[PDB]
């Protein structure tokens, strides 16, 4: 039966959409053949769509292009392409675990302690409830906002 | 109040001819415009096509109707549901001759559309003459389809008489599809024909064409059952004796139990021991105690006999 011909597509698209967002795209029972069809013909798109955000960020770096449209679109396409890869840098930090290594952190902490120790440094307390400077401080904060 | 916020929308939405001969043609014309437009929107889309014809027959018949199906068949030849729809609408107004050409066209145009082939003959029976059905049924066998093409050809030959043609048709089917079930299907016809001599030579012919690699174990019992019908003791024994030798480990046990069933009918309990002892050894025994347990069985069988 050919009641799938048109039907297959509404996945394809949703798959593509899913990619751009970075959400995964598991789908309940559909043929492992047609899972791949669509993992493949997405992968294509995701080149000719990345490719371009390369090629137009280097017709802007230069100067050539104008009209928001292009400097608007190929600012989006980056903002995704970059969020994609700030996602991996997080996930593959909890999976690969701290890069510091305790021994390194121990030295960095302790050496820091000796520096503050050398200064005769006093740590910053919590704001007293009778503090002459706070009213002045607040106004500044708002004036900045 | 979550499920009630949806159901309350449905119930709220739920609550919310012809005279003369001249005025009908206006009405009839505008429905033609409607249909023609829907065709221009979609070249193919057989729902809009099929509909359009049906509509014209009820109103008029012939040209407008008989063109539109022809016109739509140019857009897609091999849509079976259009083929049929077009055929039925002829015979609902009774012109068979018209259809018999149109039926042939399809048959030719596509031979592996069984639905056409059966439907070709079925019309023929209602129509009458039986000699037309055969020439039709014959040229389906040149494409040499399947049992269910043949057996529907033979059950024409049984509903009506002339049972010599049926037998020759049975022969042809053997040559094209040569397998066991077919051969035993041939013998069925000689049973109702009532020619015991004529049965045997057919069963003989089966052993000629097949050969050792082609025959089943089932074949020899299908032979044997016929000997119970005649109650011939001379045939029975020598068939089984002969048949047992080609199968051994492949299909042994099933045949032995049928041999004893005959001996149950007809001092002479020698093969009773031989069939039991062979089946006892035939029982597989993986291990040490399993094979030693079987050694107790066959030794007692050897001891008594």
């Amino acid at each position: 039966r050919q009641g799938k011909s048109k039907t297959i597509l509404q996945h394809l698209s949703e798959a593509w959409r899913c990619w751009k967002a970075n959400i995964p795209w598991k789908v309940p029972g559909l043929p492992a053949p047609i899972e791949n069809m669509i993992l493949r013909y997405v992968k294509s798109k995701a080149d000719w769509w990345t490719s371009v955000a390369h090629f137009n960020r280097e017709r802007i770096r230069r100067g050539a292009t104008v009209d928001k449209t292009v400097a608007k679109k190929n600012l989006g396409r980056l903002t995704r392409l970059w969020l994609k890869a700030e996602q991996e840098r997080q996930h593959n930090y909890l999976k690969d675990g701290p890069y510091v290594t305790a021994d390194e952190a121990v030295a960095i902490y302790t050496t820091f302690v000796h520096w503050l120790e050398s200064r005769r440094f006093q740590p910053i307390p919590f704001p007293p409830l009778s503090y002459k400077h706070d009213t002045k401080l607040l106004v500044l904060a708002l004036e900045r906002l | 109040x979550x499920x009630x916020x949806x159901x309350x929308x449905x119930x709220x939405x739920x609550x919310x001819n012809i005279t003369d001969l001249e005025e009908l043609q206006e009405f009839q014309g505008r429905k033609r415009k409607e249909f023609e437009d829907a065709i221009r929107r979609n070249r193919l889309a057989m729902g809009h096509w099929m509909r359009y014809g049906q509509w014209e027959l009820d109103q008029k018949e012939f040209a407008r109707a008989r063109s539109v199906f022809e016109r739509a068949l140019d857009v897609d030849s091999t849509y079976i549901p259009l083929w049929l729809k077009y055929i039925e609408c002829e015979m609902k107004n009774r012109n068979i001759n018209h259809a018999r050409n149109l039926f042939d066209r399809a048959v030719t145009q596509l031979p592996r559309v069984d639905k056409l082939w059966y439907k070709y003959v079925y019309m023929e029976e209602m129509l009458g003459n039986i000699t037309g059905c055969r020439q039709v049924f014959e040229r389906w066998l040149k494409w040499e389809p399947d049992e269910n093409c043949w057996m529907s050809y033979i059950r024409m030959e049984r509903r009506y008489h002339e049972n010599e043609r049926a037998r020759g048709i049975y022969e042809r089917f053997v040559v094209v599809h040569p397998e066991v079930t077919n051969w035993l299907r041939w013998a069925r016809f000689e049973e109702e024909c009532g020619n015991a001599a004529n049965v045997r030579q057919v069963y003989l012919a089966a052993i000629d064409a097949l050969g050792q690699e082609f025959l089943n174990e089932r074949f020899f019992i299908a032979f044997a059952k016929f000997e119970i019908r005649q109650k011939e003791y001379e045939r029975a024994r020598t068939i089984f004796k002969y048949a047992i030798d080609f199968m051994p480990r492949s299909k042994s046990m099933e045949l032995y139990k049928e041999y004893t069933h005959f001996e149950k009918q007809f001092x002479x309990x020698x093969x009773x021991x031989x069939x039991x002892x062979x089946x006892x050894x035939x029982x597989x025994x993986x291990x040490x105690x399993x094979x030693x347990x079987x050694x107790x069985x066959x030794x007692x069988x050897x001891x008594x006999x």
Partner: protein, 48 residues
């Protein structure tokens, strides 16, 4: 444009057997979006 030259015999190889398990193994669940669900067509939240 006019109608084409009438078609020829199709002459396919014989249609293969299909089975009811095969025709179920090509079952295609209608997909539904996170975003583009136009018209109405309400769908419960346990089917998402």
């Amino acid at each position: 444009r006019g109608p084409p030259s009438p078609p020829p015999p199709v002459l396919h190889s014989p249609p293969r057997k299909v089975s009811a398990q095969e025709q179920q193994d090509w079952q295609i669940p209608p997909s539904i979006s996170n975003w583009k669900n136009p018209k109405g067509y309400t769908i419960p939240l346990d089917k998402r």
